[PDB]
């Protein structure tokens, strides 16, 4: 997006603020999706397998990590 640097401000914190605005608004992620075309089969496969990844990490996280290792 845009940031503003006001007076009496270090430049390096403004550079890091700009990187944070880039991470927040989404330049990199949507650009990385929009280099080359994805057929709607593959975007459906992506979102569905991501949902399986979220619950197949999550249920192992909630109930297989409640018992100790050693």
């Amino acid at each position: 997006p845009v940031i503003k640097v006001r007076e009496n401000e270090p430049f390096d914190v403004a550079l890091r603020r700009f990187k944070r605005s880039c991470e927040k608004a989404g330049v990199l992620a949507e650009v990385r999706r929009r280099e080359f075309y994805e057929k709607p089969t593959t975007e459906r496969k992506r979102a569905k397998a991501s949902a399986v990844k979220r619950h197949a990490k999550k249920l192992a996280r909630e109930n297989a990590r409640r018992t100790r290792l050693y």
């Binding site: 845009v2 940031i3 503003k4 550079l15 080359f36």
Partner: protein, 117 residues
């Protein structure tokens, strides 16, 4: 040698170059310096140090225009923005505000097909 003391900097970075164009407020460009002009051909064109030497030459190219304070616009992904905005104040400048103005389509057109290899 037309004195315009303030200005805007466009930093177009794709994955294969880094073109830095220092322009006035009204859009009239004053001279540029790409990452690929100053030597730096092939795989050494896309390094962030190429953006550093590009902004380096681009800052010294406009000494007759008396640019004392500038506004950074950046456009595109890839090894551009960070190294060139770090170099653009080691060059000696007063960057008053920084913006990312990358062009995003709102699901407009069809991008080309996927590179298999």
């Amino acid at each position: 040698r037309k004195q315009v003391s303030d200005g805007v900097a466009h930093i177009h970075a794709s994955f294969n170059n880094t073109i830095v164009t220092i322009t006035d407020r009204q859009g009239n460009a004053l001279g540029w310096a790409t990452a690929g002009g100053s030597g730096f051909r092939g795989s050494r064109k896309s390094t962030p140090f190429a953006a550093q030497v590009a902004a380096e030459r681009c800052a010294d190219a406009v000494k007759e225009y008396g640019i004392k304070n500038l506004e950074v616009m950046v456009k595109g992904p890839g090894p551009g923005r960070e190294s060139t905005i770090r170099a653009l104040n080691a060059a000696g400048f007063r960057i008053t505000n920084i913006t990312d103005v990358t062009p995003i389509p709102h699901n407009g057109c069809r991008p080309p097909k996927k590179r298999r290899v």
